[PDB]
Write a structure and sequence with these properties.
2 copies of one chain form a homodimer.
Chain A (H helix, E strand, L loop, with lengths): L9 H18 L9 H30 L3 E5 L3 E4 L2 H8 L2 H10 L4 H5 L5 E3 L3 H15 L4 E6 L7 E5 L2 E5 L12 E2 L5 E5 L2 E5 L2 E5 L2 E13 L6 E10 L8 H9 L1 H5 L16 H23 L7 H4 E6 L6 H12 L4 H11 E4 L10 E3 H7 L1 H21 L4 H7 L2 E2 L5 E3 H7 L3 E4 L2 H9 L3 H6 L4 E3 L7 H6 L2 H11 L20 H26 L8 E6 L8 H17 L8 E6 L7 H17 L9 E6 L4 H7 L5 E4 L11 H7 L3 E4 L5 H8 L5 E2 L4 H10 L3 H7 L1 H12 L11 H9 L9 H15 L2 H13 L6 H13 L11
Parallel strand pairs in A: 1-4, 1-13, 4-12, 13-14, 14-18, 18-19, 20-21, 20-23, 21-22, 23-24, 24-25
Antiparallel strand pairs in A: 2-3, 5-6, 7-11, 8-11, 9-10, 11-12, 15-17, 16-17
Helix pairs in contact in A: 1-2, 1-4, 2-3, 6-33, 11-12, 11-14, 13-14, 21-32, 22-23, 22-31, 28-29
The structure holds the ligand O=C(NC(=O)c1ccc(Cl)cc1)N[C@@H]1O[C@H](CO)[C@@H](O)[C@H](O)[C@H]1O (2 copies).
PDB class: transferase
Keywords: glycogenolysis, type 2 diabetes, Acetylation, Allosteric enzyme, Carbohydrate metabolism, Glycogen metabolism, Glycosyltransferase, Nucleotide-binding, Phosphoprotein, Pyridoxal phosphate, Transferase
Assembly: dimeric
């Protein structure tokens, strides 16, 4: 049907149809008479998977023969979403499969909806790892993603009576056609025990053993015949584990205790919790991965060359135990001297930071590490002593610096600061947007920057244009390709060529047409799956991301109520119609975030049923926001809400997805928003609110929310409505916690940006009244989104951190 | 190579080779350079599995169109062993696959050894279910085996310092290529809750739900293109199960509690234990199975026709809850009146008993059923009242009969007698050998036989000649086929034709040659896998079965020590050399059985290292006895030990396996031994010991073991050796429990049969000295083993219980 989806040749279509029929028969053991739609999905998945196999085997043999430097991306999260369509895109199989299935009397889009998301992440950090894997394969890097195969990913969110309910994400229930178990590469991981000192150094003895069994998933590059590997570890009890009838039975049932390590993803993305099971998960991935790395390195004695053949990237501090684990292996097992082992470790490891909020930073209680990992604690203490010796030599007499920089934090409970461990043991430390990286050097890591300035870098985040344009928005991809060709898909900077089409009447009409089509489709999705009705002609005002106080869904809520109150005051006055959509999951233990979700639904309950409002304002909570839902809502959006308090959102990546898909942005100068505005031009962005410097000024003076309440009558009205029970008539004091926080302990200064926000929103509505000028500004955004391709990000990591050159060259098919 | 293994046609071999290469590439994602022997096994398994698929789909569609009466075999145990070779045998693919793999440079026998046993049973009862499935498919019956998919089957047995150690049988670790998950047929099972009475009858409410997910395994008939189904249920928690971060995490981890139902096979085959988890297993299989049966019946309103289209066979009392569960569904859900529901239930269900030992009978505490299954307890009480009303009418004034026959047993704890439930609710009750069925009518079920004589039947056990001749002993199968053709494989009575070859010099030599070859192969197996050395020219004296006091491995031990002591007394006297092999697992909580294993190894430790003995006597404990080991040792045996106390072994089936494979039998007149001797002629069996009547006489008088000790000097010597520490020099009193039991509380009268046993063993040695006459008696045994084919057994079940006619006719390929 459309050019960018590839060729549907007679040979290929015939071959796909027969292999589909073969899988339905031999693999699924069904015939057309009893086959369910799910059976048809699996037959298609197996058919597409077959095309990956040859390329997968030949890519891995290519790396063996060429022996390039290998990149190991370590993460506790890989937020992959669905695999079927992505695989078809990267193999140029989409149109062929579409035709093949059509001739069989099936709708491929219907089959695509059956696949479960691989929801092995919380949000931005996990999705970044996924985009990175795609870009690394597309840039021909010998890269491996290493993580945990959780049985249960991020919970499915149900909304019941306006409240979030959590249910288990049993994503493996029907099987996973993409993974391949590799029980032959099973490795032992050790826990507990004690340290014994011999003449020949330290020994870690009397340990409990858990087995790590790998499952491999292929990661296809975009049309370059490269297929890399994501290897996820699963926990298995050894067969003599815990080994009378009651006693025998119990010993077998107790195997669950060991296998619980890989059972479930921790869904807390707001607040670090020092739970033992999470620590076990973190060591489990690190220990199994490093053995695998060393094995591959030896199968190429001389560890001097280790950093020339191995790079390890730490996605946050979650896999930070790689540093003392590498030291443990090199010193205790390989018998290298400390200084040489440390040199190898530093040159091998690099660390990426994703937040400056102190409550999110990992600080493990010493007593936990003492019991679980006694040898690692000893190694950490030795690292600390040697590091602080260097600090004392560089800054003599500065005793407070010594306590500030220590890996060991004193207090009620002694803790290890995992961020300090990562900086000391890495040759590179990076933030994820220019402003974030600068904040790291000026604030929380200032002391470390002064000691070792060369270590600190910036690597601005990106998103893959395969999933986030071609896959989710084929209509937009096609109209662009019609003008400038197909090369932009793996060279996104080429979108700048669209600047010469900003006054092109045909292109203006096409861009606006694609957006309208996307909005109609999404409006239809809402009625079919959720029975909710919306006006497709309204401005689609969208805020989708995890629920956090810092992200300020609450500020959005205040604007919504303002709009509602203004309509009620002057009902017969014209306003630009809006559909306000807010979606995202709250961490199960985060009370305030759960209250914010309830507020959003409560506002909807009032606004959506007021006859005076009509179809001029609608408020919808988007249930179960996840990768597959993002692929639907983002192409449909007109307005992207990126309204975090300046200095709190390290980068954001949702912002980039909206920019690429033809939405305009209302946002603060925070994270990557700053660079987005710089690329597009400030005239083409809706910027409002305090800058980082303004926040700092307010903090020095003291933030008093009452001042704003006193001086802004429209804000006072909203707070009075919330307090008096206007949005909860049967529970008048339901939102008391929210009001109390806003009035007395708001870390994120919601009131301080309120006036500028509402003002800016008026300017948005003004522009939307002029469709041609709205669309011209959209074109200026799409045309300058090139910088935010994760291909650019990965090329910078490769050149400036890993010491490898990317390659766009094809491998033979 | 050999005729019975089928044709190796050019077309087939070429096709097998290419499909093997396809699976190695596409299914296993490997190439020949990195492929392990396990990969090669899986490639072959998938290749053979492909050949089953068409026949499997077309068999099941045939049953839908023809709508015959369906047979449902319910069992908590299916002792299947390996599947690869059995599938090749039944599809006539063995020679073709042998050639295909040979041309690929692989040894198929080596690949066969890689498959894990499906050890989902304890012994005879579980193996009977497996032979039955094979025979039902071979006889063209529309039969389904229903059970539990245990994650862990019977434990692997390790011998450490002469003691049994148990380790988990993680048989699914590498995957199971034979099964197909059917998550679309997942069904809910209810537990706990309470009973509510409405105007419209009883309601079972407030229950906990566990999901039952089916896995289907194909069961091929012998060369008739029939492929039936074994459906095994796996336990799954619902997604809102048990649904704060700690709280959310724990709720997900607690899903293990529900899924523990299908985790492990209970290994206690000696003594009934009323454990809650076992009760849950029993209801789980029954509840899921009956829903599946009813669904299939409705997809053919009128339950009068239910018994015309459905037969349910209960393998022991383990699935006895089918009776009140069927009543529950018919009365509570379908709203049938009690009397009609009961008529349907009785006509549908039949019950097979497997032992008369009281400690093995299921007697569930009422308090357990009260909590777990409150509605079933009510139904059982109602069944009991109505049944006892009939008893009182038939035998007026007989108050003791009423308490004897009650389903409810009074005492310290009230219990439900599950055997009484089964008799009351079944139209047929059978024992498993003629003597056993007679003992049931005369002793434990006498009262029930007097009330309803028509209910009681005999169905003598059998074994499948596919696995237990063609598969394990191809050399013997071939020499038989050379003389009488191939028809005997599915018509074992044809072996009677071999009686005209008893004086045939060529045949005598061939039979003896096959046995010698089998012994050499097994002697080689022992050295390679276990590093133990044996004389292949010695008489192979074998006792393999689960370790039980009633089976009297101890009597065998006494004979061994007698032989040893006689050699030590007269070293330069000639004795027929023997290799005494004893193998079998002990239930983990069975102390005496564990002591018996230690005794056997302790005897071996003395005997095998005595220079005066030389190679004249060897005692070996066969570690980890299981189906695949049985297939190796049975073809190698000369002497089969079947020495249970008369009246204790209901049938035995190991006995029949030895008879078919050319071993002579030393045995008591117990179980099927009686019928074996009747078929072959008493002259051609080594019969010794008390008959059932002699045991009864001794019990009336009182069994005094001291009498035998006092009057038999050779027995006295052995007991003195055991007591004084001759077989345990470092722990002199190690075997005190054994001596004490033998002397003071031996339920099974080991001493009473000792003299006759030793005497009979001398007659065995005498015959073995004359190879030609030994072999002629062997031929007379093989020739009369036809009755003991499970095809004969199943044909009798079909005609006399299920009301269906078997068919040997082919389905189209
Ligand atoms: O998503 C996360 N963090 C988590 O999910 C998280 C997960 C676990 C803990 Cl303990 C803390 C935080 N961080 C985000 O990373 C993105 C990728 O760099 C950034 O765009 C975003 O600013 C940041 O909040
Ligand atoms: O194997 C068993 N029983 C068990 O495994 C068993 C399993 C569980 C319990 Cl609670 C009790 C016994 N019984 C045997 O059945 C065979 C088949 O009918 C007979 O040949 C044999 O005599 C009998 O002991």
């Amino acid at each position: 049907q459309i050019s960018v989806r590839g060729l549907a040749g007679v040979e290929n279509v015939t071959e796909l149809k027969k292999n589909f029929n073969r899988h339905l028969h031999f693999t699924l053991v069904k015939d057309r008479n009893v086959a369910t739609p799910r059976d048809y999905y699996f037959a298609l998945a197996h058919t597409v998977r077959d095309h990956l196999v040859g390329r997968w085997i030949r890519t891995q043999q290519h790396y063996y023969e060429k022996d390039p430097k290998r990149i190991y991306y370590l993460s506790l999260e890989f937020y992959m979403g669905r695999t079927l369509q992505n695989t078809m895109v990267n193999l140029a199989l989409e149109n062929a499969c579409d035709e093949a299935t059509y001739q069989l009397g099936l709708d491929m889009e219907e089959l695509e909806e059956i696949e479960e998301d691989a929801g092995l992440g919380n949000g931005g950090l996990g999705r970044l790892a996924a985009c990175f894997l795609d870009s690394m394969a597309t840039l021909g890097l010998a890269a491996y993603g290493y993580g945990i195969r959780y049985e249960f990913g991020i919970f499915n969110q149900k909304i019941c009576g306006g409240w979030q309910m959590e249910e288990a994400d049993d994503w493996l229930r029907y099987g996973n056609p993409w993974e391949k178990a590799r029980p032959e590469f099973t490795l032992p991981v050790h826990f507990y025990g004690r340290v014994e000192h011999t003449s020949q150094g330290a020994k870690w003895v009397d340990t409990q053993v858990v087995l790590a069994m790998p499952y491999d998933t292929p990661v296809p590059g975009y049309r370059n015949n490269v297929v890399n590997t994501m290897r996820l570890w699963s926990a298995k009890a050894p067969n003599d584990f815990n080994l009378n009838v009651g006693g025998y039975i119990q010993a077998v049932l107790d195997r669950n205790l060991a296998e619980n390590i890989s059972r479930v993803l921790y869904p807390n993305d707001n607040f670090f919790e020092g739970k033992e099971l999470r620590l076990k998960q973190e060591y489990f991935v690190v220990a199994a991965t490093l053995q695998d790395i060393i094995r591959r390195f030896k199968s190429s004695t001389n560890f001097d060359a280790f950093p020339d053949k191995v790079a390890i990237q730490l996605n946050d501090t979650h896999p930070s135990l790689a540093i003392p684990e590498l030291m443990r292996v090199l010193v205790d097992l390989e018998r290298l001297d400390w200084d040489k082992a440390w040199e190898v470790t530093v040159k091998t490891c690099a660390y990426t930071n994703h937040t400056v909020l102190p409550e999110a930073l990992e600080r493990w209680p010493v007593h936990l590490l003492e019991t679980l990992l006694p040898r690692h604690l000893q190694i950490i203490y030795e690292i600390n002593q040697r590091f602080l010796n260097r600090v004392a030599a560089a800054f003599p007499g500065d005793v407070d610096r010594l306590r500030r920089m220590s890996l060991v934090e004193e207090g009620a409970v002694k803790r290890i600061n995992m961020a300090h461990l990562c900086i000391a043991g890495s040759h590179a430390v990076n933030g994820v947007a220019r402003i974030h990286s600068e904040i790291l050097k000026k604030t929380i890591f200032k002391d470390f920057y002064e000691l070792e300035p060369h270590k600190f870098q910036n690597k601005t985040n990106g998103i893959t244009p395969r999933r986030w344009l071609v896959l989710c928005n084929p209509g937009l991809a096609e109209i662009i390709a019609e003008r400038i060709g197909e090369e932009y898909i793996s060279d996104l900077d080429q979108l700048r060529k669209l600047l010469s089409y900003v006054d092109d009447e045909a292109f203006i009409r096409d861009v606006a047409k694609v957006k309208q089509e996307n909005k109609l489709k999404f409006a239809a999705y809402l009625e079919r799956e959720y029975k909710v009705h919306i006006n497709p002609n309204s401005l689609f005002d969208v805020q989708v991301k995890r629920i956090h106080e810092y992200k300020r869904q609450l500020l959005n809520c205040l604007h919504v109520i303002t709009l509602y109150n203004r309509i009620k005051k002057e009902p017969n006055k014209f306003v630009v119609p809006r559909t306000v959509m807010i979606g995202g999951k709250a961490a199960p233990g985060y009370h305030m975030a759960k209250m914010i979700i309830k507020l959003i639904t409560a506002i909807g309950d009032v606004v959506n049923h007021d006859p005076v409002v009509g179809d001029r304002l609608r408020v919808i909570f988007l249930e179960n926001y996840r990768v597959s839902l993002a692929e639907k809502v983002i192409p449909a959006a007109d307005l992207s809400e990126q309204i975090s308090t300046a200095g709190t959102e390290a980068s954001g990546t949702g912002n980039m997805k909206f920019m690429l898909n033809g939405a305009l942005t209302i946002g603060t100068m925070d994270g990557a928003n700053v660079e987005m505005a710089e690329e597009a031009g400030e005239e083409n962005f809706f910027i409002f609110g305090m800058r980082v410097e303004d926040v700092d000024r307010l903090d020095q003076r003291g933030y008093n929310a009452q001042e704003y309440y006193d001086r802004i009558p429209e804000l006072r009205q909203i707070i009075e409505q919330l307090s008096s029970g206007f949005f909860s008539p049967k529970q008048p004091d339901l939102f008391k916690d929210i009001v109390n926080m806003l009035m007395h302990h708001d870390r994120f200064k919601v009131f301080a940006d309120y006036e500028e926000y509402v003002k800016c929103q008026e300017r948005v509505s003004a522009l939307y009244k002029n469709p041609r000028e709205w669309t011209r500004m959209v074109i200026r955004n799409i045309a300058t989104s090139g910088k935010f391709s994760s291909d650019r990000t990965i090329a910078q990591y490769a050149r400036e951190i890993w010491g490898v050159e990317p390659s766009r060259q094809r491998l033979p098919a």
